[PDB]
């Protein structure tokens, strides 16, 4: 194929820009493979904080009581200890506050569920026979 081109498992050469354009330019779908188009995009440095609008803030700037981010979640409830509250974080087993908002944890040997408040019990004798 040309240097400008991309090669498909069906044996077709296509202009490289086509890749991950979501058009099925190659009927094999090699042109739109998930592992070809996926990327580690949601990241920001350890020095920083990340906000719902797609913007990242230096930890000193966070909780300055001033809008850094469109959604204001740097400030929205910053410094409040939600796990001291009861109606919010209505959670099964253990509640751990974080600098803004809360997170939840299950007891050892238990498992935590996609609602991120429910706890479950592993069937260890199928999960890990070892």
């Amino acid at each position: 194929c040309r240097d400008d081109q991309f090669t498909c498992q069906n044996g077709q050469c296509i202009t490289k820009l086509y890749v991950c354009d979501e058009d099925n330019d190659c009927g094999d779908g090699s042109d739109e493979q998930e592992h070809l188009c996926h990327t580690p995009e949601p990241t920001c440095p350890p020095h920083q904080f990340r906000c719902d609008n797609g913007h990242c803030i230096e930890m000193g700037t966070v909780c300055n009581h001033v809008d850094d981010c469109s959604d204001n979640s740097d400030e929205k409830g910053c410094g409040i200890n939600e796990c001291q509250d009861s109606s919010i974080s209505h959670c099964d087993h253990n509640c751990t506050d974080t600098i803004t908002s809360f997170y939840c944890s299950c007891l050892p040997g238990y498992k935590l569920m996609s609602d991120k408040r429910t706890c479950v019990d592993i069937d260890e004798c199928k999960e890990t026979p070892q």
Partner: protein, 499 residues
Amino acid sequence: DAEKQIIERMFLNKTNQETIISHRLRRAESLAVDWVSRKLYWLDAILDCLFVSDLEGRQRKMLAQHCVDANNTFCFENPRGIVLHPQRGYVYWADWGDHAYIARIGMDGTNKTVIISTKIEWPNAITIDYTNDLLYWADAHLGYIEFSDLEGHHRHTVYDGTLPHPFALTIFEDTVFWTDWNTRTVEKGNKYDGSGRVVLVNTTHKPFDIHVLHPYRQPIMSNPCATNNGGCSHLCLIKAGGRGFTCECPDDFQTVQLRDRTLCMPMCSSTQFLCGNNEKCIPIWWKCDGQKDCSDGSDESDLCPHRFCRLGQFQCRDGNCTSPQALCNARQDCADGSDEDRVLCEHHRCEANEWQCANKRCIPEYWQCDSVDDCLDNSDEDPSHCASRTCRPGQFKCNNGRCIPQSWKCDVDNDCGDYSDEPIHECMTAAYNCDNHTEFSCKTNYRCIPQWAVCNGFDDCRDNSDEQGCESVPCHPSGDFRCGNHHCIPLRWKCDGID
């Protein structure tokens, strides 16, 4: 024994040695023995089938043929390994054909099922652990040992791509033992994580199939067939699930059911002979050979001609000898012409891997419409026949009435002569993408070759892309040897007298 093509039994004190099956073993790959119902199971890779018999070889039945998933996706092509579980009433085996699989069938032939179908290319070894109901298998191409639960739903790796060509596997306590062809060795490791690994011994020849001998590897359970074979007339086999039994008939008998009863009707062919007890039916040449073949002695009667010919040859009225393959092949091979007698050839039946012609001749099924007059009556390539033909499970048919393996569809070679095996508009779809664990793709065309085909010295896909970059392909750290051609070979083949 594959050189003699026989099955033998002996006592563990070496005192007595006996041959149990000596006939119709084309390519027997593996053997299993059942201690509960007192049975012998084995696999054949030329008839592409699974057989059951009694420990003395007095009766035989064929329990599986064709395809295991009803979809025809997998099918008996290279069945290598076998293992038994009586408490669940299951027989497990593995196949290393184009579509490798592990499948289980019930000891009476029921509930044919596929257990493993992915990340599997050369499953030479299969075993079961009865202490916790686990199934272990080894792959020689992917170089792994894996274990699952008997349904196949959870998978774990003892070794994850570090074993060069294992062949056989066995388990005891926290330890697993396996045989390795490429380093010609026997090794033991820990069955959950592969820890604590050592080479027990190394050999000059190929190690082949390993077992652990101790009572607990054949656990105790009650035999459902114990009382008078459960009333069965010929064969009694454990039902799927392990509770209860099923009565069945040998392979040249018809099974039928009646009120609280089962019946076996002998339906065996010309060129075969039936015994008075309705026990078995045997080849005609056996009928009078000096060896009692029926248990009742019904064949080797005194009212017989003189046996001029050697044991196993076929004898003509003149007192002349011909190989049994001569019999009913549509050409006269014996002076009498008894070789082609109407009485013998009418109601004659061929082997399971053959097709029959109007002149009562047998040819391999692949010859059936190969555009050659393999049958002198031309009955194989009758255009009406090749047009009306329906081909057996797991292969694909073409407009010219010719059939080829399903794998041969959608690749680069016009296997049917006509290009009907490669409809381009179908082949270029996502349905034919190469398996990302076991296959390699060639940049110029829509053909997949197995990963072992790459850098083997051959143009396996017609753009030669599989042999270009071989300086970059490393050999396996142990078990392989490297050649100045930038090729890797098994280390068993170094210093073997062949190029």
